[PDB]
Design a protein around this ligand. Structure first.
Ligand code: NA
Length: 374
């Protein structure tokens, strides 16, 4: 028989770069492990694959349906702080191994608010956490800019992200942000928010949120003739950003998981080869056939690392018993993942650290705007 896993994520809708990218990631992994026998001779199947569109209510309905199935031995959870936090108690109760690929809110994994101390026992995160992200972004802004304005989405991703970022700015001796506010995902009117910035004479605007929404922010900026550097979070720089913003992406900068920047580590380099072999120069690869785009780390290979690690836990436990698998994953030290080396412990359930992140900026060559290392 088989190893059955469940998965729900934003497969359709405004934020489907995450869910569908992660879906692709997991399928490829399954194939790879499957080509060589499965996990200790047991073929892996994604028995339940569900779409929540990044909606928290749908996530719950989807996780309810997955948990109900007794044959599922593990889960790749949804993209989004909303979906994740919404389902997190149901999952912690059930107690089967649960991979958080994307959601950056620290309490998702460490309810005790101490990163690397007292995690939810069955939750393993492949996110770039907000407090971790705040370090690089905090530093860059606190040295480059005088009055920063911050805008963020209303979910925990935006909420925590800002407290982590404002603080990281203070810590690097930068001045407290001259303007702040939240929007709710989907919000079309940010003129209100971009006007507060414009009137606050910001040096720059830092945004924590997602591509579709970031694009609106930037278009609102040009509409209000507020043209200053836009410093985005990793998740903001997705495909919808550039499609919505077009050539106005020039001058947007961001912190990003750097797995696909040159020079790549071997496993990032090898993954890229397998990905193109399977999917081609697709939406996630991007429009350079020679170079996979940077955003793949947060849209695809986190899903990849999550799958491979879950499978590795099973391989090492020699069972599908949750508590066992949980323990096994904790055995895994020095795992060379695509996005980072993984070294879990009974108390450390995340992997990515600042060395996996750099600051990039949209710059142009000829008539072509490219992300490049700061
Ligand atoms: Na493409």
């Amino acid at each position: 028989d088989t190893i059955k896993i469940g998965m729900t994520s934003a497969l359709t809708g405004p934020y489907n770069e995450f869910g569908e990218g992660n879906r692709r990631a997991v399928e490829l992994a399954v194939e790879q492990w499957n080509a060589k026998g499965g996990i200790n001779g047991k073929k892996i199947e994604i028995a339940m694959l569900l779409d929540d569109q990044l909606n928290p209510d749908r996530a719950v309905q989807n996780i309810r349906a997955i948990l109900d199935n007794k044959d599922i031995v593990g889960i790749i959870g949804p993209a989004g702080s909303g979906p994740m936090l919404a389902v997190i108690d149901m999952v912690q109760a059930d107690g089967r191994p649960y991979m958080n690929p994307i959601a950056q809110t620290p309490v998702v994994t460490y309810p005790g608010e101490k990163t690397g101390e007292k995690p939810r026992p069955n939750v393993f995160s492949f996110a770039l956490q907000n407090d971790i992200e705040a370090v690089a972004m905090g530093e860059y802004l606190a040295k480059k800019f005088k009055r920063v304005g911050i805008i963020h989405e209303s979910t925990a991703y935006g909420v925590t992200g800002v407290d982590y970022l404002a603080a990281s700015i203070a810590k690097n001796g930068g001045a407290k942000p001259v303007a702040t506010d939240s929007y709710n995902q989907g919000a079309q009117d940010m003129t209100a928010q971009v006007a507060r910035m414009k009137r606050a004479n910001v040096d720059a605007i830092a945004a924590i949120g997602l591509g579709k929404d970031l694009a609106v922010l930037r278009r609102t900026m040009a509409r209000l003739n507020v043209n200053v550097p836009l410093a985005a979070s990793n998740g903001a720089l997705g495909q919808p950003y550039q499609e919505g913003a077009g050539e106005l992406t020039l001058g947007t900068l961001g912190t990003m998981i750097g797995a696909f920047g040159n020079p790549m580590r071997a496993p990032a380099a090898d993954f890229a080869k397998a990905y193109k072999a399977k999917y081609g120069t697709d939406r996630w690869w991007g429009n350079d056939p020679e170079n996979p785009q940077l955003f793949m780390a947060i849209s695809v290979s986190n899903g990849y690392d999550a799958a491979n690690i879950l499978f590795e836990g099973i391989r090492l436990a020699n069972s599908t018993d949750p508590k066992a698998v949980i323990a096994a994953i904790e055995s895994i030290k020095d795992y060379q993942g695509v996005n980072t080396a993984y070294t879990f412990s009974k108390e450390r359930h995340h992997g990515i650290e600042t060395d996996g992140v750099k600051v990039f900026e949209y710059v142009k060559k000829g008539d072509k705007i490219r992300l490049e290392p700061i």
